Design a protein around this ligand. Structure first.
Ligand SMILES: NC(=O)C1=CN([C@@H]2O[C@H](COP(=O)(O)OP(=O)(O)OC[C@H]3O[C@@H](n4cnc5c(N)ncnc54)[C@H](OP(=O)(O)O)[C@@H]3O)[C@@H](O)[C@H]2O)C=CC1
Ligand SMILES: NC(=O)C1=CN([C@@H]2O[C@H](COP(=O)(O)OP(=O)(O)OC[C@H]3O[C@@H](n4cnc5c(N)ncnc54)[C@H](OP(=O)(O)O)[C@@H]3O)[C@@H](O)[C@H]2O)C=CC1
Ligand SMILES: Cc1ccc([C@H](CCC(=O)N(C)O)P(=O)(O)O)cc1
Ligand SMILES: Cc1ccc([C@H](CCC(=O)N(C)O)P(=O)(O)O)cc1
Ligand SMILES: [Ca+2]
Ligand SMILES: [Ca+2]
Ligand SMILES: [Mg+2]
Ligand SMILES: [Mg+2]
Lengths: 410, 410
């Protein structure tokens, strides 16, 4: 049996996680859901609680904590440990019953639980790319300290890459380690992208797109922040750095390819030039499940891929002029040091501003660019604790700086 | 230090084998070509001997044995063991300084060397699908005895599938072994096809197609026999059975897909519905190479795949009315027993008849079908000496039956 905790369970990733767990459990009793953890969504959390009956429930916010104890009372013969805040999260991460944790918390906030889960030697099914981007070499140092802890990528492209690998090679090393790509004989990564909703617009249309146009479409079924990031292709930008860190592939060996059918989720080119790819309908259940079953696979009753019915698959290069966030991400990755933290932090603010119609499309890249130009490289701390503090302060600094730049230009 | 013998060195597979070995050795001096074996192409073999200086040369047609011996004296610093016939082949198969044997010998004939290589516990990089189709159950039995013998598929769709598998599991089993697909979590196989030259033709056009049509318009440079089989899609029919035997996959779990671009060379659907595919330009060098380096990869200077330039990939289901050879293969496969041997044997005749302009395109399938319809199930010999003999008997019966069906009509 596999004991699983779901962090951010009422969000997009967490809901998908619960679905695929539920559907698989109907075939064989594979998973136990031992913990749920959300931020405010007490009601939605309670409904999941009703059905899954986890031993642990937790809400980050204290203000909604009382309400949650009361709702839960309604459920008969169920008496769960009801916790709150960072404290509850640490209690969960350190339970001896929980084996694997799904981190579906959004933004830089997700780093906090990702680190405690590693410190506690857990398998971490990590959806939250903001954490790898902003805290890559820290998480690297944390994995070397806690040798049994593992990060298994849930981000669809990174799961796709991971599936295409020989696990006998993978087991010799692990995600986020130095030399991962050499052990696995990886030569190059094709990073697939939907292209987002703005893929066909001219530069002059781009100047005037609003947040509503970015959120509009039914094909983009995720949280509001990653939706916006898909529209600017900053999401792919962030996934380029995530690839660098998860697999230790050089930036010049990562190629972004727009594939609007979203069947081929990414491809790995090996040193012999043979390329391997993972394909399925655009669905996050596959990558979630794999991270929980890896290095094995289990039966699902998901719709099989009908290749004849999909019929056509297209590939083209993205326009760097229409999507300059991409180039910014490459520049920040290549620069190294804390430039990825700076990139991610300033994006968080520039993203939110566009979402709230406070800035225009091309301002996003304008803002992120000026913050990266302002940053001064710091020597990287040797001890984990000071590196952690260093990242927090640099992330906080960049948000502050983006807020200055924004305010100076409006 | 990989010591490789090349059987069929002068044909299309054998040539591509030497090409990839040549280019790979310019990077890393891995490969020793220890032996070369051909039928009659002595000047072509002499030109190859000179380049690769093998410890053994073997010519099958003994009438040209003196010619070979006398061309070879023109080579400096060279003193090879020069052998001929079956006995020459047997000697090579038993030599300890030979680890891997590439079988690029066409037709049923290739089963002899395949069997002897297995009996000497070699790794057999097998291009000759005819031996798997005629003698699948026997090869299986044989590999169960010579436990260190391995068959690694060289056929590109099968190498593709082989590559898509997770080697952490492949190493725990081997091709042609019970439970291969259970162990590897294989749900189904998408077996890809170029579709041949006749893929757009109506039925009335198909009636009239000739061998000149099939040979000028081919999708890859190959031997005449597979070229013709590609035109009728009997090749794919054969490959459906080769898949069944190599990978222990149920017939109703193998789906033929026409992919005219031939970038995707085949796809494996795993029990979770996730699909993994192998991709490269149309080439045989990689499938060959991988058969020779598995479980490892090595560097090549092959041109890397450029998905963006490729731009479009298409798929569709083949039509069984236009390509009845496919349907006959499933039927032979599903019936089991010696039906696949009959299918292969009668195809060898019909293919050749059409090649030589004696019969029409629908006569190929029509002749094969009658011979299949005529064959009567036999009890399967439980020992290897005998099963081999039984296979030879039926094979030559089916060949003679096909020829009789032709003679009684033209
Ligand atoms: N959604 C997708 O298809 C994909 C998502 N990702 C990544 O996965 C992550 C999650 O994205 P997504 O699911 O879209 O986002 P959502 O906004 O839909 O979900 C975020 C979840 O995190 C919870 N949460 C936020 N802060 C905290 C906290 N402080 N403590 C505990 N829980 C918290 C939210 O709780 P509450 O409901 O109470 O507010 C919610 O359940 C992102 O980092 C994203 O980049 C990556 C690839 C695909
Ligand atoms: N070519 C391709 O891309 C593919 C080929 N295959 C398979 O590979 C096999 C070979 O095909 P291909 O190379 O196209 O065929 P070719 O006709 O080009 O070559 C056959 C080779 O085998 C040699 N040969 C034939 N009979 C004997 C024998 N009695 N003893 C020793 N050598 C012999 C020939 O020698 P000689 O030159 O002296 O006549 C020749 O070198 C076939 O079974 C085919 O199905 C499978 C997938 C792809
Ligand atoms: C259909 C679909 C799949 C993937 C995405 C990507 C965004 C979401 C994501 O990162 N996933 C699913 O991993 P994008 O960055 O390629 O636009 C969008 C839409
Ligand atoms: C480009 C190309 C790929 C595959 C083929 C097949 C025939 C040869 C073959 O089996 N190969 C290359 O594995 P087909 O049966 O699909 O037509 C021809 C041309
Ligand atoms: Ca593999
Ligand atoms: Ca009968
Ligand atoms: Mg993604
Ligand atoms: Mg083939």
């Amino acid at each position: 049996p596999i004991n699983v905790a779901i962090f951010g369970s009422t969000g997009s990733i967490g809901t998908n996680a619960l679905n695929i767990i539920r559907e698989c459990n109907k075939i064989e009793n594979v998973f136990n859901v031992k913990a749920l953890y959300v931020n405010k969504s007490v009601n939605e959390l309670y409904e999941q609680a009703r059905e899954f009956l986890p031993e642990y429930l937790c809400i980050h916010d204290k203000s909604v904590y009382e309400e949650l104890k009361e709702l839960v009372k309604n459920i008969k013969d169920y008496k769960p440990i009801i916790l709150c805040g960072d404290e509850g999260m640490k209690e969960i991460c350190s339970s001896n019953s929980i084996d694997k944790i799904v981190i579906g918390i959004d933004s830089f906030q997700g780093l906090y639980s990702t680190m405690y889960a590693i410190m506690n030697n857990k398998i971490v099914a990590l959806a939250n790319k903001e954490s790898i981007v902003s805290a890559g070499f820290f998480l690297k140092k944390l994995l070397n300290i806690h040798k049994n802890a593992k990060i298994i990528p849930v981000d669809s492209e990174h799961s796709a890459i991971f599936q295409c690998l020989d696990n006998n090679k993978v087991l010799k090393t692990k995600c986020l380690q130095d030399n991962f790509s050499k052990i696995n004989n990886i030569n190059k990564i094709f990073l697939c992208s939907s292209g987002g909703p703005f893929q066909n617009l001219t530069m002059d249309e781009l100047k005037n797109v609003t947040s509503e146009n970015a959120l509009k479409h039914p094909k983009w079924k995720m949280g509001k922040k990653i939706t916006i990031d898909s529209a600017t292709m900053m999401n792919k930008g962030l996934e380029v750095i995530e690839t660098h860190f998860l697999f230790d592939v050089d930036y010049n060996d990562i190629e972004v390819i727009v594939h609007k059918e979203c069947i081929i989720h990414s491809c790995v080119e090996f040193i012999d030039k043979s390329v391997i790819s993972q394909m399925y309908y655009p669905d996050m259940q596959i990558p979630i499940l794999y991270s929980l079953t890896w290095p094995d696979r289990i039966k699902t009753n998901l719709k099989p891929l009908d290749l004849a019915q999909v019929s056509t698959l297209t590939f083209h290069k993205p326009s760097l002029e229409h999507f300059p966030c991409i180039k910014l991400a490459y520049q920040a990755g290549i620069k190294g040091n804390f430039y990825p933290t700076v990139l991610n932090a300033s994006n968080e603010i520039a993203n939110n501003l566009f979402l709230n119609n406070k800035i225009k499309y091309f301002d996003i890249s304008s803002i992120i660019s000026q913050v990266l130009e302002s940053f001064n490289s710091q020597k990287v701390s040797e001890n984990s604790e000071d590196l952690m503090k260093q990242i927090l302060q640099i992330h906080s600094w960049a948000k502050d700086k983006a807020t200055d730049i924004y305010n100076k230009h409006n």
